[PDB]
Each structure stands twice: as structure tokens, then as C-alpha cells.
Amino acid sequence: ELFSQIIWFVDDTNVYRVPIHKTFEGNLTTKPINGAIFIFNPRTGQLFLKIIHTSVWAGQKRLGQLAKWKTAEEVAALIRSLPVEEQPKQIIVTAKGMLDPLEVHLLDFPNIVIKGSELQLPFQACLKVEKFGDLILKATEPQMVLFNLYDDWLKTISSYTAFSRLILILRALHVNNDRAKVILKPDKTTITEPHHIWPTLTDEEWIKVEVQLKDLILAD
């Protein structure tokens, strides 16, 4: 199932980013900031972060549409740089407009099945995590960076449990950033290792955190 085959979630929601601002003259700004494609392996925790520099948009119209195609191009490029045995067997998109661009970009990979999903998996929230947000903001050229979004969790829990824990974190951060961060710091001495994304907590502390995140998402 979702935990067997190499599977990737692809999120395009942060690729083309135009902050909403009204100029002194009363018009909306149109200038983009750097974005990123998130490509996520839910069994291993592996994240490929492709940073999208604003220079790539210079020139053309209907950039929201074009960004779906850019995302697909970059997914295809990643696949071609990997050995066959590391290539995904399934690609899952939560955005419907990704389906046709991916289908056209992956015609050379007949093994790869592309499907849509109604799952709420908001990588948007990673833009609020400073490790990622700063890296994206400050980039001066495109590049790709590797991450392990499960930290050391798989030493003691299953991929299923880790995936659930991550979705709860991202969803909580997405609906209520400030309260999510409070929940994720239960003690003054709670820290996050420099190479980790998330705090170091005991598995009992995580049970309690996970209930509170669920509650926060339910409260909206």
C-alpha cells in the first residue's frame, strides 16, 4: 500500500509566490519571490527541496499556469538524474492541475503511475519553519537540497506513525502557526538539534503533542 514501492508526494503550491500588496498608487504588486517544489517520500521521510529562483519567470504571461508545467519539468529532471532503482513507481498530487503536465512530462517513464489525492498535506507550512523559509528567501539561483523530515523517529516508530506525526505537524502549523509552535515546545529546555527539523521529545511527550495538534486542527 502507501507503505510497501517508492512513492512521492509532489506539492506545487509554493512554486509561484506573489505577495499581496497595494502600492502607494493603488495597484497590486506583481513581483514574485523565490518559491520551492516539495517532493516527499512518505516511507523514508526523504524530502527533495527544489528552490525556484525568481529569474526563471522573467518574460511571460499566465505564470500561475506555467508554474504547474515548471513543476512537472523539474520532477522529470530529478527522475532522469536518479538511477532506475531509485525512481518512484507512484507520484501523488494533491493539486489537480498537476495531473496533465506530469502525464506529458513523464511519457518516457511508463512504469510511473500518476494519481490525484484529496489528502490535506500542506507543505506550505514548511515556509514557516526557519530552516526552510530562510533558505528559500535567500537563494540567488535554483538548486536542490535534501532533507530527512522524520529526523531520528524511525529508530523507534514505524513509517506509518511517522507519516501521521508529520501530517499533524504540518497541518497544525498551517492552520495556526503560533499555537502549533507552543504545543511543539512543551518545556523551556526542549530543543531541536541543528541537523533536525523537529524538536527532540520522548515518545510519551509525542503522544501528548499529537493529541493537542489534532485538537488544534479540529478547532481550526
UniProtKB/Swiss-Prot annotation:
Q: Where is this region: RNase H homology domain?
A: 1-220
Q: Where is this region: Involved in interaction with pre-mRNA 5' splice site?
A: 1-220
Regarding tissue, the record states: Widely expressed.
Question: What subcellular compartments does it reside in?
Answer: Nucleus; Nucleus speckle
What's the record's remark on domains? Answer: The MPN (JAB/Mov34) domain mediates interaction with TSSC4 and SNRNP200. Has structural similarity with deubiquitinating enzymes, but lacks the residues that would bind the catalytic metal ion. Contains a region with structural similarity to reverse transcriptase, presenting the classical thumb, fingers and palm architecture, but lacks enzyme activity, since the essential metal-binding residues are not conserved.
Cited function: Plays a role in pre-mRNA splicing as core component of precatalytic, catalytic and postcatalytic spliceosomal complexes, both of the predominant U2-type spliceosome and the minor U12-type spliceosome. Functions as a scaffold that mediates the ordered assembly of spliceosomal proteins and snRNAs. Required for the assembly of the U4/U6-U5 tri-snRNP complex, a building block of the spliceosome. Functions as a scaffold that positions spliceosomal U2, U5 and U6 snRNAs at splice sites on pre-mRNA substrates, so that splicing can occur. Interacts with both the 5' and the 3' splice site.
So which disease is it linked with?
Retinitis pigmentosa 13: A retinal dystrophy belonging to the group of pigmentary retinopathies. Retinitis pigmentosa is characterized by retinal pigment deposits visible on fundus examination and primary loss of rod photoreceptor cells followed by secondary loss of cone photoreceptors. Patients typically have night vision blindness and loss of midperipheral visual field. As their condition progresses, they lose their far peripheral visual field and eventually central vision as well.
* Summary of subunit composition and partner proteins: Part of the U5 snRNP complex. Component of the U4/U6-U5 tri-snRNP complex composed of the U4, U6 and U5 snRNAs and at least PRPF3, PRPF4, PRPF6, PRPF8, PRPF31, SNRNP200, TXNL4A, SNRNP40, DDX23, CD2BP2, PPIH, SNU13, EFTUD2, SART1 and USP39. Component of the U5.U4atac/U6atac snRNP complexes in U12-dependent spliceosomes. Within the minor spliceosome, which acts on U12-type introns, interacts with PPIL2 and RBM48. Core component of U2-type precatalytic, catalytic and postcatalytic spliceosomal complexes. Found in a mRNA splicing-dependent exon junction complex (EJC) with SRRM1.
In its UniProt entry, what is this protein called?
A: Pre-mRNA-processing-splicing factor 8
Q: Which organism is it from?
A: Homo sapiens (Human)
Instruction: Name the gene that codes for it.
Output: PRPF8
Note the residue range shown relative to the complete protein: 1770 to 1990 of 2335
